[PDB]
Design a protein around this ligand. Structure first.
Ligand SMILES: *[C@@H]1O[C@H](CO)[C@@H](O)[C@H](O)[C@H]1NC(C)=O
Ligand SMILES: *[C@@H]1O[C@H](CO)[C@@H](O)[C@H](O)[C@H]1NC(C)=O
Ligand SMILES: *[C@@H]1O[C@H](CO)[C@@H](O)[C@H](O)[C@H]1NC(C)=O
Ligand SMILES: *[C@@H]1O[C@H](CO)[C@@H](O)[C@H](O)[C@H]1NC(C)=O
Ligand SMILES: *[C@@H]1O[C@H](CO)[C@@H](O)[C@H](O)[C@H]1NC(C)=O
Ligand SMILES: *[C@@H]1O[C@H](CO)[C@@H](O)[C@H](O)[C@H]1NC(C)=O
Ligand SMILES: *[C@@H]1O[C@H](CO)[C@@H](O)[C@H](O)[C@H]1NC(C)=O
Ligand SMILES: *[C@@H]1O[C@H](CO)[C@@H](O)[C@H](O)[C@H]1NC(C)=O
Ligand SMILES: *[C@@H]1O[C@H](CO)[C@@H](O)[C@H](O)[C@H]1NC(C)=O
Ligand SMILES: *[C@@H]1O[C@H](CO)[C@@H](O)[C@H](O)[C@H]1NC(C)=O
Ligand SMILES: *[C@@H]1O[C@H](CO)[C@@H](O)[C@H](O)[C@H]1NC(C)=O
Ligand SMILES: *[C@H]1O[C@H](CO)[C@@H](O)[C@H](O)[C@H]1NC(C)=O
Ligand SMILES: *[C@H]1O[C@H](CO)[C@@H](O)[C@H](O)[C@H]1NC(C)=O
Lengths: 181, 306, 214, 224
């Protein structure tokens, strides 16, 4: 039961593979059995799904028995359990769309605390862990923070969203300041 | 008729795949693109496109009926019934030499010049429960449709209105009487599937079938219109039905291209809806020319000699 | 109708064994129109082999079918944990199709004598006007067992019922209950109640007993 | 992939009639698949009842005149469905009824021989229990004392009852026996546990009995 993590506003590719290398019938539906998009032999059929204008596969890979389901401009709500009915197989794959967005401007005085908010889907409990330009491995499940934003933290931060053996980077820029010298 | 009881499965009928492969080869020596592009991957994601450039002779591709006679050591079995699901035990089976003359018409959404349903309108489906399996409709009374390279097709608003009814009625007669039946245009996808595509005079027509599939089990659409006129368009760059890949055919030339075909059937595909209130939405479908072939071989099955 | 008589009724085997189950049809079946199924306790049967020897899609190849004269046999090589349960043969040569009586394949184990216990009716049941005497046989192998009830030394017929557990998944033993039922009236009349059990593990038939009111 | 989904358990009075249903997910059309119904009485082998093949129905000698078998193709809201009607139920109709499907598309297959066939897909089964008994919650009695102790769960209808010990905290050495049907037409079962004799005055043992059809739940302490 595969699982894929994605960043809000990014493109994710839920795979789905056929046994042999042969372009055959396949179809992408979501938990509610709503058809996302399948194929009509050599043609692509897009269904009623709200992911319509953003769903899409890879014709080229169909012959290699591969029938992905690329979702672009990924939305938190796009998070779900997309089945893939192919040759009587149901490759139900999971999709989690997280979104890390700092609050106060990237520019923040020295000492003040830095608050991070992780937008996540319901029934989802990830564990984030950013890494300061120096090394602060501070942790925060859903909402992190840097108690005292030290001037040696003013730079690129490398967070991480852990959710089922997987994780997604979220590089963020932070700027510390002064009174001045 | 043959005095025996046998199993049939048009959805897993092998003649379909034997004709399909034939119809494809009937296309590689009649309609040859100026360029044909096709995916070529090792599996390593990266996929080069294999290009092929050959002569592009303008030929007025006019389909000839095709028979299918069992050779030897082989026999064709035909099923007989006014309403055959085409997937089960047939009682009035009967061995035949060749299957009726079939005109391999490649198209989407509408099945042209096929074979009408003797009794009434029949709709087969490998599983009506599965909103992913094409529903093949079989008209018992065809609806003439005339297309022209001039840019459109005319259809009888009358006949088409009736048809949607005698189809809309056969639908609920399978998904639940106390269920509203609606018809909407393609959900999305390739031009060949979203519109009623097909080939006429070797020209790939792409007719917008919105006026044919926007029927609400309530109102009409015959205000100031006697005939339905689908705004059709001929394309040169098309997605191949024979295999994933585009193909460019040379522009039109004959002073006039014209078609007058019998809408003998459709290819619908209701949307899941996730068990929502009785409001099944059926839209045009097809694109998998085999369903076509199927709609013609649904009652056949070749078998080895005993 | 064609009769299928299946052989043996039960057999005991170990993981990795090869096992043979046989079925004799009351008439010849030229076409080999015979099928074999497995049924595990609580579940629907599953088709394993059809036409005498053909394996259905998805069935392990350690299963095979064979025929000689009017006899048809299922063979199981390299016996596996999921294989234990009950097997049936079926002819579909002539109408109507018919099944064998079935064969139970259970796990082989060393002999283990039952631990035997006897429970007098509770005071609460006696108060509600009935009396049930219960005898328990715990964790024994093989399954074959006899228990007889005696009251005031008199063999008891037709007023008892037995219940047996499925073979235990971990120690491969069985457990069995026997319940003697009688009116509060007769219970109060007689003095000694006895459960007599006979089993291969027991060098001699064991009797557990009590005197009413001890 | 074929999944056959049968209707639920029914408890029926003698003389009554019942209809059991079978939803054939994965089955295209009964024009290509035969339906065969089969039943299994408790602790018994299997017996053929009848069929629908090529839209033609029929029943075995033992059931002819008493059984109607039908099938209809459906789509969307439902898969194709077959049903079995049985009239004038008696005690010897009590059994598990299985719906069963076999493709008839390929004449050469060997699953079938002129209408007589092997059965390639099975439903879960539906229990039809034929009885005049009315629903009734059990009495629970202690079975007082390596020692053994337990609970007698007597005189209930219909099945099932469930039994745990100490709210599930005691599971090792527990044996809960299959219910037996008494002459009164009511069920009874017992549940027993073996424990070390030493803990008998130190440890508490209670059997938790649940009979949902009568909404009955009892907790019985078992004391030496
Ligand atoms: C392109 O496709 C070819 C297959 O003919 C492959 O060998 C090559 O590595 C790919 N890369 C190029 C040349 O673009
Ligand atoms: C089938 O066709 C006949 C005429 O050929 C028509 O009268 C009948 O209503 C049709 N059945 C339907 C409504 O599908
Ligand atoms: C289609 O053309 C035919 C002649 O081939 C004509 O009889 C028919 O009326 C036309 N159908 C239309 C335009 O509705
Ligand atoms: C439709 O469902 C049943 C028929 O199965 C009918 O009795 C009922 O009145 C109708 N209800 C609805 C869905 O309007
Ligand atoms: C024709 O089809 C297009 C999409 O293919 C649709 O957006 C447009 O509204 C349609 N026009 C008509 C004839 O209603
Ligand atoms: C279907 O209904 C919608 C809204 O009720 C309407 O706009 C549309 O024109 C109808 N389809 C036709 C043309 O019959
Ligand atoms: C609707 O229009 C058709 C022609 O397009 C005409 O035959 C029909 O009579 C009209 N409906 C009515 C009865 O006004
Ligand atoms: C088939 O289509 C032609 C073209 O319009 C039509 O004139 C003819 O009557 C139709 N024949 C059939 C199949 O009824
Ligand atoms: C049969 O249908 C084809 C559609 O490809 C059409 O071109 C042809 O004209 C039809 N038959 C007739 C009447 O010529
Ligand atoms: C069916 O209509 C809508 C479907 O979106 C649903 O909200 C409603 O509860 C259902 N019944 C009604 C109100 O018609
Ligand atoms: C049972 O059916 C028989 C014939 O099979 C009929 O004589 C009798 O009236 C039926 N019994 C009941 C209770 O309906
Ligand atoms: C044809 O009729 C004969 C009558 O003897 C019968 O044996 C055979 O089964 C029948 N075949 C069919 C149509 O089922
Ligand atoms: C097939 O045989 C059946 C059985 O007699 C008969 O009812 C039916 O009309 C026949 N079908 C045809 C016309 O071939």
């Amino acid at each position: 039961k595969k699982v894929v993590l994605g960043k809000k506003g990014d493109t994710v590719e839920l795979t789905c593979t056929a046994s042999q290398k042969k372009s055959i019938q396949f179809h992408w539906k979501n938990s509610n059995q709503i058809k996302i998009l399948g194929n009509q032999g050599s043609f692509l059929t897009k269904g009623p799904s709200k992911l319509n204008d953003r769903a899409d596969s890879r014709r080229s890979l169909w012959d290699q028995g591969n029938f992905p389901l690329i979702i672009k401009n990924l939305k938190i709500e796009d998070s779900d359990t997309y089945i893939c009915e192919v040759e009587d197989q149901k490759e139900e794959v999971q999709l989690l769309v997280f979104g890390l967005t700092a609050n106060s401007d990237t520019h923040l005085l020295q000492g003040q605390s830095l608050t991070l908010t992780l937008e996540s889907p319901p029934g989802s409990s990830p564990s984030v862990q950013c890494r300061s330009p120096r090394g602060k491995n501070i942790q925060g499940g859903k909402t992190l923070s840097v108690s005292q934003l030290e001037l040696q933290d003013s730079g690129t931060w490398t967070c991480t969203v852990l959710q089922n053996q997987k994780k997604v980077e979220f590089k963020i820029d932070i700027v510390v300041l002064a009174f001045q010298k | 008729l043959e005095n025996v009881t046998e199993n049939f499965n048009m959805w897993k009928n092998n003649m379909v795949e034997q004709m399909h492969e034939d119809i494809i080869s009937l296309w590689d020596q009649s309609l040859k693109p100026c360029v044909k592009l096709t995916p070529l991957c090792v599996g390593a994601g990266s996929c080069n496109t294999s290009v092929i450039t050959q002569a592009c002779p303008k030929v007025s591709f006019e389909p000839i009926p095709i028979h299918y006679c069992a050779p030897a050591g082989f026999a064709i079995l035909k099923c007989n019934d006014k309403k055959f699901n085409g997937t089960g035990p047939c009682t009035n089976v009967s061995t035949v030499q060749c299957t009726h003359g079939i005109r391999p018409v490649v198209s989407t959404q509408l099945l042209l010049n096929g074979s009408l349903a003797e009794e009434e309108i029949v709709i087969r489906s490998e599983n009506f429960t599965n909103n992913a399996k094409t529903i093949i409709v079989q008209l018992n009374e065809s609806v003439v449709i005339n297309c022209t390279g001039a840019g459109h097709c005319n259809l009888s608003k009358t006949q088409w209105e009736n048809t949607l009814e005698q189809i809309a009625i056969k639908l609920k007669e399978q998904f639940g009487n106390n269920k509203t039946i609606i018809f909407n245009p393609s959900s999305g996808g390739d031009p060949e599937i979203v519109t009623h595509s097909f080939n006429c005079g070797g020209e790939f027509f792409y007719c917008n079938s919105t006026q044919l599939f926007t029927w609400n089990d309530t109102r009409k659409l015959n205000n100031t219109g006697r005939n339905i006129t689908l705004p059709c368009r001929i394309k040169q760059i098309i997605n191949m039905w024979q295999e994933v890949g585009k193909a460019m055919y040379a522009p039109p030339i004959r002073g006039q291209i014209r078609c007058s075909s019998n809408i003998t059937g459709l290819l619908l595909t209701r949307d899941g809806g996730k068990d929502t209130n009785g409001t099944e939405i059926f839209r045009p479908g097809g694109g998998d020319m085999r369903d076509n072939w199927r709609s013609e071989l649904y009652k056949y099955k070749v078998v080895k000699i005993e | 109708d064609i009769q299928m008589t299946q052989s043996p009724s039960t057999l005991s085997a170990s993981i990795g064994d090869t096992v043979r189950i046989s079925c004799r049809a009351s008439q010849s079946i030229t076409g080999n129109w015979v099928a074999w199924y497995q049924q595990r306790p609580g579940k629907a049967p599953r088709l394993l082999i059809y036409r005498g020897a053909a394996l259905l899609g998805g069935v392990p190849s350690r299963f095979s079918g064979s025929a000689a004269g009017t006899d048809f046999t299922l063979t199981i090589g390299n016996l596996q944990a999921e294989d234990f349960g009950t097997f049936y043969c079926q002819q579909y040569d002539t109408y109507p199709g018919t099944f064998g009586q079935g064969t139970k394949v259970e796990v082989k184990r060393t002999v283990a004598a039952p631990s035997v216990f006897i429970f007098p009716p509770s005071d609460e049941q006696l108060k509600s006007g009935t009396a049930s005497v219960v005898c328990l046989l715990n964790n024994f192998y093989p399954r074959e067992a006899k228990v007889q009830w005696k009251v005031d030394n008199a063999l008891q017929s037709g007023n008892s019922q037995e219940s047996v557990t499925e073979q235990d998944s971990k120690d491969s033993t069985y457990s069995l209950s026997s319940t003697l039922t009688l009116s509060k009236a007769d219970y109060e009349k007689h003095k000694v109640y006895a459960c007599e059990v006979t089993h291969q593990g027991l060098s001699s038939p064991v009797t557990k007993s009590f005197n009413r009111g001890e | 992939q074929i999944h056959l989904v049968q209707s639920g358990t029914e408890v029926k009075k003698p003389g009554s009639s019942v209809t059991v249903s079978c939803k054939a997910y994965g089955v295209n059309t009964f024009g290509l698949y035969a339906v065969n119904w089969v039943r299994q009485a408790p602790g018994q082998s299997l017996e053929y009842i009848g069929q629908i093949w090529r839209w033609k129905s029929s029943a075995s000698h033992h059931f002819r005149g008493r059984v109607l078998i039908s099938a209809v193709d459906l789509t969307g809201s439902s898969p194709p469905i077959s049903s079995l009607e049985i009239k004038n139920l008696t005690s010897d109709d009590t059994a598990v009824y299985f719906c069963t499907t076999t493709s008839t598309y390929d004449k050469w297959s060997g699953l079938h021989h002129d209408g007589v066939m092997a059965f390639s897909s099975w439903g879960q089964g539906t229990l039809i229990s034929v009885s005049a008994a009315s629903t009734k919650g059990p009495s629970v009695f202690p079975l007082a004392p390596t020692a053994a102790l337990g609970c007698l769960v007597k005189d209930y209808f219909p099945e099932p009852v469930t039994v745990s010990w100490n709210s599930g905290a005691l599971t090792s050495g527990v044996h809960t026996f299959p219910a037996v049907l008494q002459s009164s037409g009511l069920y009874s079962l017992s549940s027993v546990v073996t424990v070390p004799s030493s803990s008998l005055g130190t440890q508490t043992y209670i059997c938790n009995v649940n009979h949902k059809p009568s909404n009955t739940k009892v907790d019985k302490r078992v004391e030496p």
